[PDB]
Each structure stands twice: as structure tokens, then as C-alpha cells.
Amino acid sequence: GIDHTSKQHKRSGHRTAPKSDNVYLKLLVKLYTFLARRTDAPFNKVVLKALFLSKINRPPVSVSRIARALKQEGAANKTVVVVGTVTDDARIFEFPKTTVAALRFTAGARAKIVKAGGECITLDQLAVRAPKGQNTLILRGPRNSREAVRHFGMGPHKGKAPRILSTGRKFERARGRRRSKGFKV
Amino acid sequence: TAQQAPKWYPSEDVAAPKKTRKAVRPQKLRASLVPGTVLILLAGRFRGKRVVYLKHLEDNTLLVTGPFKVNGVPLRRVNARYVIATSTKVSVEGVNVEKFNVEYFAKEKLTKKEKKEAKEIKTERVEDQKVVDKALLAEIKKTPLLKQYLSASFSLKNGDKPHLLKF
Amino acid sequence: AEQVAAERAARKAANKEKRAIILERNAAYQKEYETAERNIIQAKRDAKAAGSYYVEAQHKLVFVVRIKGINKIPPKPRKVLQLLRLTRINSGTFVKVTKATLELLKLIEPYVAYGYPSYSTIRQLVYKRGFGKINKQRVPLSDNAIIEANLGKYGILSIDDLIHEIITVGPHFKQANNFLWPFKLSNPSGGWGVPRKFKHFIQGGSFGNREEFINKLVKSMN
Amino acid sequence: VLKKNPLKNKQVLLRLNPYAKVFAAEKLGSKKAEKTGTKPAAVFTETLKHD
Amino acid sequence: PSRFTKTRKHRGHVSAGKGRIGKHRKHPGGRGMAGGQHHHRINMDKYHPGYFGKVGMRYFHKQQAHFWKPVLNLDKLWTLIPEDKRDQYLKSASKETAPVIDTLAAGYGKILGKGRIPNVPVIVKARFVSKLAEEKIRAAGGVVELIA
Amino acid sequence: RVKANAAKRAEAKAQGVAVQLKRQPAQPRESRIVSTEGNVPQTLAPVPYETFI
RNA sequence: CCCUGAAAAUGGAUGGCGCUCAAGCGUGUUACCUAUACUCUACCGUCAGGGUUGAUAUGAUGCCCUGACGAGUAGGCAGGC
RNA sequence: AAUAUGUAAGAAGUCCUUGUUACUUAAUUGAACGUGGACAUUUGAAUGAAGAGCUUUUAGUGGGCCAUUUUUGGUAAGCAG
RNA sequence: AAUACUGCCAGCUGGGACUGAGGACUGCGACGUAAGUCAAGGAUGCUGGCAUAAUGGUUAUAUGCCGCCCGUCUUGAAACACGGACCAAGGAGUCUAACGUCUAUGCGAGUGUUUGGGUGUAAAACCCAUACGCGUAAUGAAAGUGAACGUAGGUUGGGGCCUCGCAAGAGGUGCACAAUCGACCGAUCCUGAUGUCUUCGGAUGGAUUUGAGUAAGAGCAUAGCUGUUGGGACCCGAAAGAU
């Protein structure tokens, strides 16, 4: 008999070789497995994980975010990388003439990039152009924006957004929410 | 169909084996077996019989002869585990045994189709027995009751505890 | 790129000079052990000649074995056996000696047998039941190549360098011990010399400070 | 594939240690000590034999 | 569906994932939102605080027509202009040629100031605006002319 | 202890002499020779049981 | 240590037979018996770390290496008939 | 007293110099947070770390019992606690 | 002196059992300058008999040892606690409306054809306008007002990238994310300017206050496990009540 200290046959709890039957994704992950295996490239490891990732942790990234990243100092003629979708922010009126690498681009984003003078590149072209992350810049969209996460954590005195359907007066604005009716949470 | 196929098939060529390092040394006998020594066969047709020892062969066996004019045991090769050795010993030197070997002890195996439903010896081998055992009896008849010893057979009796016996 | 003769030959040359370094080191260690023990004997005789008494030093090192199984173990003894890496019956580990460590062993007295070992049984252990922690895997030692690949940091190149650090406890004992997987010993072939273990060694039992008969116990258990 | 143990198997023993060879050569597992019959003290031995 | 459902991994196992000690009965703690003041009090004051009671002044006969007032910010105003003429106005940033924008035909009632238009004049038609938005527009040199 | 450790590090910046700053427990003790002069060993043994009431 | 104290109901239990310088009581020395325990090896499966795109014919969820681990009601998940 | 029990064993730290302030001081005095510089392999006791941390969602359960030691009620209980 | 006892031998040798995994070469080594050989990263060599019900498998029996009747509620069941004489077939977490979490798919600040229209090999598939739902702005009881001082801020930490270096490291940029101090919008409580139909307006600056907010948008739709609620609601079961 063994006195176990940890638990036995626990998975790591990490996601490998994702659940979809997307054959192009399977090609891409074949490629980046090859690279992360044989390139000693932390960039390749990170993009491998990001390709493993699910949908809620593949949030959509904006051309405005891309512009902020390039608007960093000495970081403008870099290659932008986004393991996800690239959305069009009509809330800006300018864009540089860089290149961008990503799985998916929307119509507006494609038009924005090529109108600025850029090229929307796939990650295999990125790999064969730059197998070690030469002059790259990976970005990630905000995870903690969603309706799900504003409800996650609910309870007394946390300020954490109850899980209701309808809104207005006579919908959770009463006993427990104010002091003349009951108390303050 | 009834059963489709697999996606995949195995290899039909056998891979070679590794290079086994089990090299051959010769046999190392026990101290109690030197030539010219008397023995007792325990197994086989002549189980329980006292016989002379002459020559370890090269295929790990022992060459013996009765002698044949004494008891009825011809030349043969036997096994050192299937014999016992004795303290009793005679001289042998002044005979030739270098003639005999495995190729002399060929069997000439049968054709497998030949079936023994219901139902010989070699002039060469019998005359070899003649010359060897006449020399051997000339060497034996000096010392007393060794002929009686080989002529008689060996058994166990109520009291014969082997771990206390001394052969 | 042929890579057949020059490279293999240079590896053999590097191997040879490493063999020579290991051999001279082992010579130094033999001299050290023999010198030390014979000086201890000689100094004992000197004090006995003078009429004085030679208080010998204590032992910096012990060997501990878990005897008791995994069932019915209170939480402090259980945690302490887990800290000393004793998670099964008949399992042993080296331990450095301190106030702290010895009080710890006094906590886990009913569950272990510990004692002061010798070079002979240490060498026997590390040659027959001696393993290494390479990427959280138990690997056989089996080669000073492996051992120096893991412990070139700490002045080690060989299994005997490891044993040397062990018995002459060094500034790398911690790393050497946490490299040595705990020893997975069998039951004592000679039995335990007693009918009933679970009483202190004093009272006709087995556990506790078996301070110098631990060598006999370990050899019977290995 | 398999663990061959020292304390038999002199080949793997030498593979792990050349001092095995030179140790066996100079016969140090049975090494003699120069006998020197020094004496103990009367005070020590009478303290010992003090019934 | 039916074959990916755990009812198939309960066939043989006695209590269907509900238990031996405390069985699956009909309605052990009530039916519906029963007992919100008595024995589900902790749930009501933990996850839905404000559920019990009434607050305000009532509104008899309410009309979302009356309460129609969609909103818009100024980035999305410059989005309201169609791109195909937007680039001409942008390069030809000047007065006496400035584009008019019908927020109402765009479907909006109010206009709000969420920041950083260019400094080009532009004309806007709206029923309602905010102070900061009107200030940002006339700081870009444009104007709002109101409508109903 | 902290400011004294800093003083020790200052002295080792002055001479480079291998501080070994960390505390260490009460290590097991080293050999020695006790003499016997004026200090002969008194043999002891137990005392019988007297009730002492 | 033994004896008296010591009396309950179907016939009746150091488990039974039986045991008397014991097969009882106290203590000591050894040898011996045996667990799904311990050690070594093989095999099944899981978990973890790794290797392998190069061409042909193979599936890169493939092929291979190393290490540890395997109790289970209510229950949860996973792969399958 | 024993046993149990809190905390410290440094990098988010120590020292030197001076920046801020509507706070504080009789006071460039002090407080809090900082600029700049110095202090490494023993970066501040031992041992171990099987990865460390973090969220979401949901089952079952909410009749318990026995032993050592402490202990209440009861003469006591395979009693109740 | 020697023996006993305790310990040491990388001293020699004998006897016995179990196992032979793996499958071209690679590595560690040993004997010798070499030739090669070896017990060195897992057994080979030589021989006999059978060549078949001989070995083995199944099945019945015999023998040694063990083995209480299943299912259930139970602290505890083989129970002197319940159901079950036996066999066949039927027979119990389903579907629906709205939803939470997670995952997959498409599009993306948008998303949703399928109320309806046109059409058609016809309850299929294809195409479409207008709206409309959800989301893109919240807060307040409401009147109502309505989210950049700053590179959308400052500090600390942070994967990845860039520079120097062979490497250790050193510096710069630092997404997500975590803690914090700020600023903006709504609510509350204060100050109360240019001014004024002198009773209106509310500029500016604030506060251990408050919000399901802003702080370079992320959501919509379909499907699936799971869970919740209402429905016969996993199947069977009242004493009753009403027409």
C-alpha cells in the first residue's frame, strides 16, 4: 500500500488537440506542433496553446487594439499576430501600413487593412515567412468583458451584477437592495 | 460486405533478432569425475549398473564401456548428472579412445514416412569393442573382485539413506 | 559529414581522461576513509593510554526506514513521514542530523527504525537500490555519465563521488539527498530478530534508534 | 532495458568503478594493519575492574 | 440527443443518479418559488436581493413609443455617414460644403459625446443631444440644428 | 539580526571571506578528550526501596 | 501458583480432541509456517514527461521511449457493446 | 505545566541621497509612495514540493456508528451526550 | 599466543528454484599495442521423444481448502425485517416553453431568411423587402441627465517580441490577466458664477456616499451534455374533495 500525497491519475487540466473537426485547423496545429517541437521557440509554444484554446478564450481583437500596439514605441514596423478573429473598429480614422497574421478577418477589417495598404496573412504564411517569431507581436482580446463574467462571483457586498432577465422598477430594486425596504445587501 | 477492412496493415517481413551475447564456453565438470573412474548408471535400460568411465566428449556427455564381456554394457555416451561417481578407480592409460567421437556416434536418422507397424549391428563397432575391452580386462584382472563388482548390479535397500551413503 | 572515426575516438579520449579523474578521486576517498578510521582507532588508544577518555564524535548522518504500513497514522506522524519521503512500509532514506531533524524523528518514533550506518552498507545500497530524480522520474543510476549530467553543478562526476558526499556530509548533501530517490527495500531475509516489532528496540521490539545494528537490519532488508 | 546489479557481475562493477580493479589488485578489502602493542593505563583498567 | 444522454449510462445502476439514502421524490421543498420568505430565505437574500417588495410610483398605461429615445455617440455618427462619401468629406475638410446627417432617419433620438471626432465641421439633424456632444461638435466647427 | 547580517556583508566586502550568513540548528557535537585527574569516576548503583513514611 | 469463597434452569465447549519435570504459568534463545503487504520481473490499463513530416503504403487522434500508479457505496465524467 | 496555539525567519527586503503633499511638526521635522546608487551565489533556519495559483458548473449528502485517551448525566447499561 | 563475539572484503567456490521480457547497428565498459574476443543497453548453443487427442481447451465427476440468499431501507441483514414458487413478453429521468454554465459552428458591432412574399422536380431545397427581437449606454422612484485633462492615465507584476552577450544574465516594449491610486457618466448630499420675467438657470469645485456603468466595443443565431422552473414530469400508490 502506497501513502499517496498528491492525487493519482489527475489530468493536468490543460487542453490539447482541440475538439473541432476543422481540417484546416488540424493542418495548422500539425504545422505548429512541428515548430514547437523542433524550434525551441517559446513564441511557437504560446501560439500552440492559443490554437488549442476555446472560443470564449479566443476573444475578437480590434484594429484599434492593433493600432495601439503599433503605437507603442519602436514597435510599429512589427508583424501583428492574433490567434483568433480580427474585427473592424469604425471608431478610428487612420491605420498604419504594417502586416497582420490571423486565422479570421471580417469583411470590414479586410477592407480597412487593404485600404490602409496592409496584407491580411494566414498563420502558415507567417510560419514559412518567420519560423521563430522574427519581429512579431501577439495580441489578445479582453476576456473579462462578457455577460458571463460580470455575473460570475455573485453574493453579498461584492457589487457583482445579479442574474436577472428583465429590468426596471419592481425587478430586484427593493428589500436587500436599499435601506427603506430591508437592508443594503 | 460482411467485415470491411482496417485503415492500416502490419508488416509482413520479420525483423532480424538482436546480437545475442550468449557466447559458448566449454563444460566445467565437477571434481569427482576424472577418467578411469567407476560409475553407476541410474537412468535408461542399464539403470542401476556399475560401469567404467573413459572420456568426456565435446558435446558435454561422457563416454563409457561396461566392459562388455563382464556385464553386457557396450560403449555408450551418457550424462554426468544421470550418473554417480565413486571413489573406486582403475587405470586406463595404454588404450586408444581418440578414434571415438560424435561422428562415430552418428545415428543415421530414419525417413519419417517409414512406419514401424510390427517389426543390424556394425562389424567395425563390435571389433572396436573387442580391442578396447580386451585391453581393459587385461588392465582390470590384476586387482581383486572388480570383475565381480562390475558383473553385479546396484540397488537401494531399507536403510540406504543416500545423503549418508558414500559411493 | 562522415562522423564515424574522429568523433567516436574523441569521445573515447574524453571518456578515458574522465575515467582517470574518477580513479584518482576514488583513490583520494579511499585514503580519506582509511586515514580517518585508523586515526579514530589510534586516538582512542592514545587517550586510553593517557588514562583519559576519548569522547568520540556523534554521527552527522542517519538512515531511516519506515516499518509501519499506511493505515491508522495520525496527522502529524503522517505529514512527517511524507516530509521524509516514507510513503510505504520497508522504505528508507538518508537524513542529516540536527536538533530539528532529531525532534522530527522523535515524533515519528513508533513508525520508523533509524540508525547510524557505515560506508559498507551505504555503498551496497547505492549500488543495488540506488536511483535518481531526472525530470521527476526514478531512473537507475547505472552510469557516471547520467550522474554527472545531473550533478555537474555540485562537484559530482560519479556514483562514488555521490556516496562520498553522503557519508562525508558536505555543502551539497541537500541536493544529493533530494536527488537520491528513497530506497525501496524488501523484507529482512533474516527476519527481524524478534517476535513482535512494535515496541522500542530496547524493550524487545524493532522500531526507534537501532543506533548501530541498523547495518545488520539494512543488509538483511537488501 | 534491465538493471544489472554490482556485488556480482564484475563487468558492470568495473564499468561503474576502476578502483574496483586497483582495489582488487592491491587487496585492500583484506588489508593488514601494522601491529603496535601500545599499552593502556593502570588508572583506566582499575576504574574498569572496580567491582 | 437520446444516445448522448446519461439515461443510457444509468441503465443497470439502481437509482438513476438520484440516490439511495435521499430518494428522488416529487417536490420536497415546495413547488415553484414557494417559501421565499421562510425556507428559501438564504437563496432569496444571496442570489436575488430586491425580489420581495415594490418600490416606485406606478405608471398607468405606459407606452414604449413615448419612451423611444435611442442613443448614439460621435464615432458612430461618423460611422452613420456612408464610407463612399465619407472619405471625400474627410479629405475635403472645410466649411460651406459640410455634410448633413439625419440621425432620425438613421433611427436615433439623442446624441451623446463619447469622444474624439476629427476637427472638421459637419452638420447634424437631431431631436436631442448632450452638453459635451454639442461642445465637441462646435469645437470641431460643426453645428447641430434641431428637429422633431 | 538583519542589520548585523549587513555588517557581516560589509566585512566580506572589505575582505571577501565567505560569510556563511544563514542560521543553522544545534548541529551534533564533535569529539574531545575528558581527563581523569582529580576526577576519578565514582561507581554508582541503585538504592533499595525504603517506604519513607 | 493452587484451594475455599464460586448457586440456574435443552446437553456443551481453552474452538474441539486432549494436555500434568505439559500441549498449563512466567521468562529467554533460535529455527520454522504464512497476507490481495514488501522487493524483482513480465503482462493489461490510466496519468505524466519526451522523441518522430522524410521519402514509399498508410492513418502524426499514428509509431516508439521513459517513470509512477491501480480499493471503492451515493455520485460525476470518459471510451465502448 | 505537558499537549495544543499566533507570528517572524527578507527582493513587495536593508542602507545612503533627495522629490511630492491641501497631512503633521516650532521647524525640510515626521508620515506614505517614489527617483538615483549600493548590498547576490548562503538573497538570510531545516525538510519536501508529486507542478503553483484561479474560476465556472453540478451530483450525492444533511438518520450515522465503533475503539484508545479526556469527559457530563445516571447505581449501572451493547444507556443517553 | 589463540579462540569466541562484533564488524570488513569491489576474496574464491559449490548446490537449488523462478524468470528469458526486447528484437539490424548506435552507448557504457573489460582482455590484449594489435588481431579481435567478451559474462559489456534483456538466451543462446547441443541433443532426444512425439509427430499425435500426446500437451492443451471445454464439460461432468471425484478429492483438499474456502464459500450463508439475492434486491432493499439501514450505524449495522444470511437474518427470527420486507418482496421473490417458476418462465415468457411488456415495464419506469421522457417531451415541451423559457433559461444559467461549458463546448462546437457561421457572421462580427452587428446578428437572426423560413410572420409573410416570389419560385419549385413540392410539406423539401433556393431567393427577398420592410420592420421587429437581442446587442452596441448606463443611472434614478421619477422629472431627467448621460460616459477621454492625460499617447484612454499613474504604480507593481506579467507571457511574447526587440537590443547587447557564446551563456548566465542586463536593458527596452510590455496584450490578456491580478492588486491598487486616479479621471469620466448617472443617483444622493454641499458650494452657488456670468446672468435673471426675481424666480428661473446651474458654470466651476467638492464628499470615509452610491450604481447590475465608461476607461480603442463583443455580441447574435443554431446545435449538444448538464442543471433549474412550470407542465402527469422517473413509474406505481391514498384517506379525501367537487360536478
UniProtKB/Swiss-Prot annotation, chain A:
Gene Ontology molecular-function annotations: RNA binding; structural constituent of ribosome
SUPFAM superfamilies: Ribosomal proteins L15p and L18e
InterPro entries the UniProt entry points to: Ribosomal_eL18, Ribosomal_eL18/eL18-A/B/_CS, Ribosomal_uL15/eL18, Ribosomal_uL15/eL18_sf
GO biological process entries: cytoplasmic translation
Domain of life where this protein originates: Eukaryota
Main localisation: cytoplasm
Name by which UniProt lists this protein: Large ribosomal subunit protein eL18A
Biological source species: Saccharomyces cerevisiae (strain ATCC 204508 / S288c)
Name of the coding gene: RPL18A
Swiss-Prot record, chain B:
CDD domains, per database record: KOW_RPL6
GO cellular component terms attached to this protein's record: cytosol; cytosolic large ribosomal subunit
Origin: domain of life: Eukaryota
Phosphoserine modification, residue list: S11
Record localization: Cytoplasm
UniProt xrefs under InterPro entries: 60S_ribosomal_eL6, Rib_uL2_dom2, Ribosomal_eL6_CS, Ribosomal_eL6_KOW, Translation_prot_SH3-like_sf
One Pfam match: Ribosomal_L6e
Keywords associated with the record: Cytoplasm, Isopeptide bond, Phosphoprotein, Ribonucleoprotein, Ribosomal protein, Ubl conjugation
Transmembrane domains' residue ranges: none
Chain residue ranges for the region called Disordered: 1-21
Keyword Ribonucleoprotein among UniProt keywords: yes
Keyword Cytoplasm attached: yes
Any one biological process term the GO annotation gives: ribosomal large subunit assembly
Any GO molecular function: structural constituent of ribosome
Quaternary structure and interacting proteins, as annotated: Component of the large ribosomal subunit (LSU). Mature yeast ribosomes consist of a small (40S) and a large (60S) subunit. The 40S small subunit contains 1 molecule of ribosomal RNA (18S rRNA) and 33 different proteins (encoded by 57 genes). The large 60S subunit contains 3 rRNA molecules (25S, 5.8S and 5S rRNA) and 46 different proteins (encoded by 81 genes).
Family of the protein in this entry: Belongs to the eukaryotic ribosomal protein eL6 family.
Additional free-text comment from the UniProt record: Present with 38400 molecules/cell in log phase SD medium.
PANTHER family registered for this protein in UniProt: 60S RIBOSOMAL PROTEIN L6, LARGE RIBOSOMAL SUBUNIT PROTEIN EL6
Entry protein name: Large ribosomal subunit protein eL6B
Gene: RPL6B
UniProtKB/Swiss-Prot annotation, chain C:
Family matches, as SUPFAM superfamilies: Ribosomal protein L30p/L7e
GO molecular function, one term: RNA binding
CDD domains hit by this protein: Ribosomal_L7_archeal_euk
GO biological process terms held by the UniProt record: cytoplasmic translation; maturation of LSU-rRNA; maturation of LSU-rRNA from tricistronic rRNA transcript (SSU-rRNA, 5.8S rRNA, LSU-rRNA); ribosomal large subunit biogenesis
Domain of life: Eukaryota
Major location category of this protein: cytoplasm
UniProt miscellaneous comment: Present with 101000 molecules/cell in log phase SD medium. There are 2 genes for uL30 in yeast.
Family from the record: Belongs to the universal ribosomal protein uL30 family.
Protein name in the entry: Large ribosomal subunit protein uL30A
UniProt source species: Saccharomyces cerevisiae (strain ATCC 204508 / S288c) (Baker's yeast)
Phylogenetic classification of the source organism: Eukaryota, Fungi, Dikarya, Ascomycota, Saccharomycotina
Gene: RPL7A
UniProtKB/Swiss-Prot annotation, chain F:
Record keywords, A-Z: Cytoplasm, Isopeptide bond, Ribonucleoprotein, Ribosomal protein, Ubl conjugation
GO molecular function: structural constituent of ribosome
Name of protein: Large ribosomal subunit protein eL21A
Origin organism lineage: Eukaryota, Fungi, Dikarya, Ascomycota, Saccharomycotina
Any one of the GO BP annotations: cytoplasmic translation
Other comments on record: There are 2 genes for eL21 in yeast.
Gene Ontology cellular-component annotations: cytosol; cytosolic large ribosomal subunit
Intracellular or extracellular location(s): Cytoplasm
Function: Component of the ribosome, a large ribonucleoprotein complex responsible for the synthesis of proteins in the cell. The small ribosomal subunit (SSU) binds messenger RNAs (mRNAs) and translates the encoded message by selecting cognate aminoacyl-transfer RNA (tRNA) molecules. The large subunit (LSU) contains the ribosomal catalytic site termed the peptidyl transferase center (PTC), which catalyzes the formation of peptide bonds, thereby polymerizing the amino acids delivered by tRNAs into a polypeptide chain.
